[PDB]
Paper text:
Recently, the actual enzyme involved was identified and characterized from A. thaliana and was designated as feruloyl-CoA 6’-hydroxylase (F6’H1)10. The product 6’-hydroxyferuloyl-CoA is converted into a simple coumarin scopoletin via spontaneous trans/cis isomerization and lactonization. The activity of F6’H1 is entirely dependent on the presence of 2-oxoglutarate and the Fe (II) ion. Sequence alignment showed that F6’H1 contains the conserved Fe(II)-binding motif (His-X-Asp-Xn-His) and the 2-oxoglutarate C5 carboxy group binding motif (Arg-X-Ser).
In this study, we determined the crystal structure of F6’H1 apo enzyme by molecular replacement and also generated a homology model of C2’H structure. Diffraction analysis of the colorless plate shaped F6’H1 crystals indicated that they belonged to space group C2, with unit-cell parameters a = 193.22 Å b = 54.55 Å, c = 78.82 Å and γ = 111.5°. The F6’H1 structure consists of residues A15-A343, B15-B141, B144- B344, 28 solvent molecules modeled as water and two sodium ions. As expected the F6’H1 structure closely resembles the structure of the A. thaliana Anthocyanidin synthase (ANS) search model. Like other members of this class of enzymes the structure contains an N-terminal DIOX_N (PF14226) domain, residues 62-172 linked to a C-terminal 2OG-FeII_OXY (PF03171) domain, residues 212 – 312 that contains the catalytic site22. Strands β1, β2, β10, β7, β12, β5, β4 and β3 form an 8-stranded mixed β sheet, which assumes a β jellyroll fold common to this family of enzymes. Sheets S1 and S2 together form a large (2,309 Å3) hydrophobic pocket that contains the catalytic site23. The F6’H1 substrate binding pocket is contained within the C-terminal 2OG-FeII_OXY domain with its dominate feature being the 2-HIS-1-carboxylate facial triad (residues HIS 235, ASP 237 and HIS 293) that is involved in iron binding. However, in the apo structure reported here the iron site is occupied by a sodium ion. Many of the key residues (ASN 218, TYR 220, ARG 303 and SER 305) involved in binding the 2OG co-substrate are structurally conserved in the F6’H1 structure.
Author numbering: 15 to 343
The structure:
Amino acid sequence: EVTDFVVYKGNGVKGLSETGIKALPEQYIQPLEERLINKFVNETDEAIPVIDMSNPDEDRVAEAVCDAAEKWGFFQVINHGVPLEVLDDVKAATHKFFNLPVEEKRKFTKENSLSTTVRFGTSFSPLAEQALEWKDYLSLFFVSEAEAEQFWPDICRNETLEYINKSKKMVRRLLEYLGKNLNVKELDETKESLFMGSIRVNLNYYPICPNPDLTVGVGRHSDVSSLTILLQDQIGGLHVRSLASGNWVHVPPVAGSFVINIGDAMQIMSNGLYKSVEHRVLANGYNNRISVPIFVNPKPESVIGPLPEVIANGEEPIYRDVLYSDYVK
Ligand code: NA
């Protein structure tokens, strides 16, 4: 139907959006409860914690992260150390990829990509008979720089690699914070595979939508990551459900900012201390948007479970130890 143009012929929702369609197809019309929160107007005051990492006493900034991570499951960082040059080469390379001729982006579909670690796809849905999301993406699972050379798009490889390169030390800082109340004062090599074992990065593009209220960019969900890290563009559109009020908060795209949330893996290993919370992506009817999330994960064969350091003081374990790959599968 419309599936043919979008999916089977690989135009995606961007090229479909570029046909100037005045009306949204049935495939993307989200359920009622999704369309209700789209029409939910907000509280004029509540917001996600903003943390300045350039602040000297590094032990107040430490307990700020988990004053954020325990109650909100979400926070933003402003002076994180990743040079702002890199954030704006990668957001460009994202655009120059999606603005590539279609003939060349068909090369990274599940059928045409010469590696499964790379895949350009469109209109996602976890389940069958379910509404699809108004979104195109390029999912990049990191193996090596070698497998980047051979399988990553040349028009956006170096920017992405460099963006991983620079982000990964900020990540190390954040984790060695996080261990605070988890009684883990130094990052070691077994835990490094439990937290930063595997890395995946998506290049997201959200084209302008004719009927923004019927669909979403991303449906209600919690990341299964250890933690994510979100680089938004200047419109943004992240929507987070609070644990205090229970309402939904629109997250403001700050000058030179990352949005870090929390994943199932961290919640499990923290024995429920950290919260992996629900969040959406709104559809915008006026502008095209992009998004470059990094998904920081355990290794696929990592057996995660409550860290021994969290259960030693006579607390009881809330979770089984489970294989990570069997969990996401
Ligand atoms: Na997410």
